[PDB]
Amino acid sequence: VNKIAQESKNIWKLQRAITILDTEKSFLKCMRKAFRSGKLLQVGFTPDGKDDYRWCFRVDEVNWTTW
Amino acid sequence: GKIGVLAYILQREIHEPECRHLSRKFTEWAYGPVHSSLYDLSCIDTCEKNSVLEVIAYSSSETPNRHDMLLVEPLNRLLQ
Amino acid sequence: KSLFVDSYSEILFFVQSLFMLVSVVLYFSQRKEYVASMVFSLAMGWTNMLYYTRGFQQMGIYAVMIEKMILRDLCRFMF
Amino acid sequence: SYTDSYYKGQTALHIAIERRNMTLVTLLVENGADVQAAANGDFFKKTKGRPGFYFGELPLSLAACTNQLAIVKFLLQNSWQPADISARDSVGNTVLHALVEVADNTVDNTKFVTSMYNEILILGAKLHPTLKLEEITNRKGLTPLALAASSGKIGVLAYILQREIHEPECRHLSRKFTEWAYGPVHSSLYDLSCIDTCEKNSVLEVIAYSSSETPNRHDMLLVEPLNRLLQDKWDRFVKRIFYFNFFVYCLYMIIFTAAAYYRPVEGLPPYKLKNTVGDYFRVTGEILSVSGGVYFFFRGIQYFLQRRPSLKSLFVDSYSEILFFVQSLFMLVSVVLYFSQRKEYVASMVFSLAMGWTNMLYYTRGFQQMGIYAVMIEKMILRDLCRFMFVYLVFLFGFSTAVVTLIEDGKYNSLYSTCLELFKFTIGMGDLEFTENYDFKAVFIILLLAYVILTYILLLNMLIALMGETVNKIAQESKNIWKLQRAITILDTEKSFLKCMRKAFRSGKLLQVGFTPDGKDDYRWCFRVDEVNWTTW
Amino acid sequence: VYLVFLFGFSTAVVTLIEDGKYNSLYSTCLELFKFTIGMGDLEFTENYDFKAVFIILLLAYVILTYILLLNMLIALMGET
Ligand SMILES: C=C(C)[C@]12C[C@@H](C)[C@@]34O[C@](Cc5ccccc5)(O[C@@H]1[C@@H]3C=C(COC(=O)Cc1ccc(O)c(OC)c1)C[C@]1(O)C(=O)C(C)=C[C@@H]41)O2
Ligand SMILES: CCCCCCCCCCCCC(=O)O[C@@H](COC(=O)CCC)COP(=O)(O)O[C@H]1[C@H](O)[C@@H](O)[C@@H](O)[C@@H](O)[C@@H]1O
């Protein structure tokens, strides 16, 4: 037990992810709301003039340096 | 299980003309110390066959870093 | 080998289901051994409740450590 | 400025300050920009469920929170429109309240927030010597010190409580003062205004009665002036009273124990009092026991009313009060059953009696080693025993159901007896051949051996290993929690005090500086601490 | 700590027992002590009413002392 603490935390997260994937794959109701994060425009400037919507996921972060 | 390469890719951000589109991490706004980044998530959440989550989660148990790969910021937050 | 070293939980659930089905076959086979299978399934079923400890940060780690202990320390000690 | 509710009040000056553009800030101020304009949109509030950045809503607080000292100095000391350093937002927060808010106890954050705090304090003194910024309270009534104490911003307290300013005409802002220094030894003086006692928000009260959600409520008492002050209060005033209370409780439990032990065995209470000495003492002890139960009952209600725990704080914390209250509840139920002519008053009474004796461990606080031992027992019960007991009960129940299913028309043949009989294995008393009323001996013995291996061999040794891991990690946490329990005991004692005693107020009305901004002298109730250092001769 | 627990539960149990073989602080104290050495009978008497109260008290005592306190002692000795 002294040697499998962190390994245990990673395993916990891992098989919880397994649970998530099985839930969304089975889903028993033809539900599309499982596809999250919203269709956002990242750059709007592809190599051509078109705009790219790429289903981004938002993460807000705070830093006290590199102002 | 090449965790380093994923660590590079999943948060790739390129600041120059004609190469921003290659970025998978984009900075939307940054007010003071706070700022909101956007992770691309193509082929992470879902795709035709090899979604990254499917590949990691259904690994063969011999992949070196299968416990570690889901610690990479976008994946852990997405799973939560 | 990947059939056994991982997916411990799926194997246990499958074995529970096997014991249930064998209990059924013996039940309609007019054999009183159906009890023997049935109780095993029942026992297995309650134990497999620990599968659902996962999704709890505190209990799931405990269950994971049970799995690791069974694979390494208990097996060596029992030998 | 913006008119939408999301960015309401944002103006150009906020942008120039926020972007760290000195030139535009200067130009906008020159053109009459309002340095008091309040950015009070949703984005500029705490607003946990949405993105935002709370900074006190004012330009000065913005420059302060952004580590722009030059802009702060300009905003206060520009020609066109100097800023009001005492200005307050919609919450009532000043700049200093904002600086407390933005703190997060990380190293660089603490460093710069502390530096900016010191700078703004100096500027406030020089611009307005009669103005005392720290005394200003927000709509929550909290001074920046009180806010820092409540919010767990340990770094800010670590600065403030031992703040010392080495320059002329700012000495009176210091809270730490060095009276004499002979060789390596010198005697410092800590102020402790509004730490020991004040109108409402004494720092010790704020920390001790915290809501359990403050991050560093355990760590904050380690800051030297508080720890020494509590130790002095203990030694001088509270140690004796606490020992006396413990003695009284021991007497109470002994009386209760004796009264219960000599209960009569006749049916149908209440019982006629016999005219003999033994029964007179018996009924006396009964009455005293009931009286004490009522006392604890009302203390529990008083606690609940005074703190008003919100139905999670009622259970996640303050276990001692709940346990004592539950004991008193059992006592009262015993009384009701007794006079209701129900023999079940015995059943309640023993429970109360049992809990009473275990609640004796509450008094292990005040003794260094024993209180720590009690805290570790509390943590063990809450974490490891709970997890283990859940899993063990799953195993026990599963195998009990399997075996009792296998058993047919035997003596046991029932869930209660089988559960008990399997449980006997855990205490080293399992028979392993307790019945033969079955078919399939092999199945039965396999089930028992599987249960024994899984529970007795694997699980118990696993529990021991996990407890061993746990104690390895909770040592310093135990130290902090014991010190906190001592602190709350001290505060309760001094607050109750039952005698209008003022001697609880320590440290002596000493003169710190004698030179206020005016010619008056300052007496500040300082607490003396002597320290020796063999460097910086 | 163990003696406080032992004494408290001994007092509770001997109060609960009435006109029994044990019915006395000494015998009940020894009888509860026997649990610590893995010899607790757990059904040593029926001279009471309210069987549920009796068994609940014994179970609480066992859990608090035998399961928790002894294993805690082992852990602390490990640290020491
Ligand atoms: C490892 C295999 C698949 C195993 C399957 C069955 C037969 C099992 O016996 C064992 C052999 C055994 C027998 C006796 C003592 C220890 C081990 O252990 C497990 C297996 C041993 C267990 C272990 O229970 C657990 O694993 C809890 C658990 C932990 C983690 C999980 O992810 C989980 O998913 C369900 C379950 C319980 C039994 O199924 C059970 O309750 C009965 C009656 C026998 C146990 O075979
Ligand atoms: C039938 C018989 C059953 C007896 C059941 C009970 C036996 C244990 C009795 C042991 C007595 C220990 C005690 O007297 O108190 C223990 C309570 O034990 C439990 O955990 C009960 C588990 C339910 C700690 O209580 P405390 O008031 O100190 O709570 C702390 C705060 O005060 C502190 O400021 C901190 O916020 C800290 O986070 C809090 O913990």
Curated annotation (Swiss-Prot), chain A:
Predominantly expressed in trigeminal and dorsal root sensory ganglia. Expressed also in hippocampus, cortex, cerebellum, olfactory bulb, mesencephalon and hindbrain. High expression in the cell bodies and dendrites of neurons in the hippocampus and in the cortex. In the brain detected also in astrocytes and pericytes (at protein level). Isoform 1 and isoform 3 are expressed in brain and peripheral blood mononuclear cells. Signal peptide: none annotated. It is found in: Postsynaptic cell membrane; Cell projection, Dendritic spine membrane; Cell membrane. Phosphorylation by CAMKII seems to regulate binding to vanilloids. Phosphorylated and modulated by PRKCE, PRKCM and probably PRKCZ. Dephosphorylation by calcineurin seems to lead to receptor desensitization and phosphorylation by CAMKII recovers activity. The modification Phosphothreonine is found at T19. Residues 1-27 are annotated as: AD. The association domain (AD) is necessary for self-association. Belongs to the transient receptor (TC 1.A.4) family. TrpV subfamily. TRPV1 sub-subfamily. Responses evoked by capsaicin, but not by low pH and heat, can be antagonized by capsazepine. Non-selective calcium permeant cation channel involved in detection of noxious chemical and thermal stimuli. Seems to mediate proton influx and may be involved in intracellular acidosis in nociceptive neurons. Involved in mediation of inflammatory pain and hyperalgesia. Sensitized by a phosphatidylinositol second messenger system activated by receptor tyrosine kinases, which involves PKC isozymes and PCL. Activation by vanilloids, like capsaicin, and temperatures higher than 42 degrees Celsius. Homotetramer. Interacts with PIRT. May also form a heteromeric channel with TRPV3. Interacts with CALM, PRKCM and CSK. Interacts with PRKCG and NTRK1, probably by forming a trimeric complex. Interacts with the Scolopendra mutilans RhTx toxin. Interacts with the spider Tau-theraphotoxin-Hs1a. Interacts with TMEM100. Interacts with PACS2. This is Transient receptor potential cation channel subfamily V member 1.
